[PDB]
Amino acid sequence: VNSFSGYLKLTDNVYIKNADIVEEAKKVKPTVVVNAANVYLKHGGGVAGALNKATNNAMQVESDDYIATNGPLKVGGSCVLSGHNLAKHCLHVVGPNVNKGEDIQLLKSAYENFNQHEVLLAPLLSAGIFGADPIHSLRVCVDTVRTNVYLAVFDKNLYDKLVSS
Numbered sequence: 001v002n003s004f005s006g007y008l009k010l011t012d013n014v015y016i017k018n019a020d021i022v023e024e025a026k027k028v029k030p031t032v033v034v035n036a037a038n039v040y041l042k043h044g045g046g047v048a049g050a051l052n053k054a055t056n057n058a059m060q061v062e063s064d065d066y067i068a069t070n071g072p073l074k075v076g077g078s079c080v081l082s083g084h085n086l087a088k089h090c091l092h093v094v095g096p097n098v099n100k101g102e103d104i105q106l107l108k109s110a111y112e113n114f115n116q117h118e119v120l121l122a123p124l125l126s127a128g129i130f131g132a133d134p135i136h137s138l139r140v141c142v143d144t145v146r147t148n149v150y151l152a153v154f155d156k157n158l159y160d161k162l163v164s165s
């Protein structure tokens with residue numbers, strides 16, 4: 001239904017809000033929610049763990065079946081799976097693990113996956129344990145995504161830092 005409310009408009013197509021992405025998805029019921037995944041779709045913590053828990057583990061079951069059939073994703077790549085109760089679809093996107101030496105240029109390829117969908121609810125990619133500077137990830141998002149993206153930033157201090165700049 002895509003009834004996004006309370007977002008700050010950064011550009012014509014990028015919007016941002018201090019919010020829990022699971023709570024947003026339950027309110028809005030978007031066509032697409034983006035998961036910040038790893039190449040094996042092991043949804044162990046962070047955004048991925050929270051989305052999986054909200055689907056009662058069904059996201060993990062579907063992901064495991066995807067991996068058994070297709071093998072792991074490429075860094076910078078993605079796949080569409082069901083959004084279960086949270087969204088129509090879930091776009092699982094793999095940003096680079098910058099801390100482990102994966103090329104940060106792949107953050108551009110990661111965000112390019114968003115351009116296949118007219119509107120997305122999404123987190124900042126690579127911006128937790130993967131070690132990418134969230135200011136940098138937001139800039140790559142703005143420079144790369146041309147479709148409508150609604151970004152949810154969980155931590156208030158970080159949101160305030162991103163929107164001040």
Ligand SMILES: Cn1c(=O)c2nc(SCCCNC(=S)NCCN3CCOCC3)[nH]c2n(C)c1=O
Pocket residue numbers: 019020021022036037038042043044045046047048049050123124125126127128129130131152153154
């Ligand atoms: C509601 N909401 C948020 O909106 C939110 N945004 C963040 S920061 C960036 C997104 C998450 N980090 C990524 S780099 N993980 C790398 C891949 N992982 C996949 C499985 O685990 C191991 C590795 N954290 C958040 N959390 C916890 C949250 O609940």
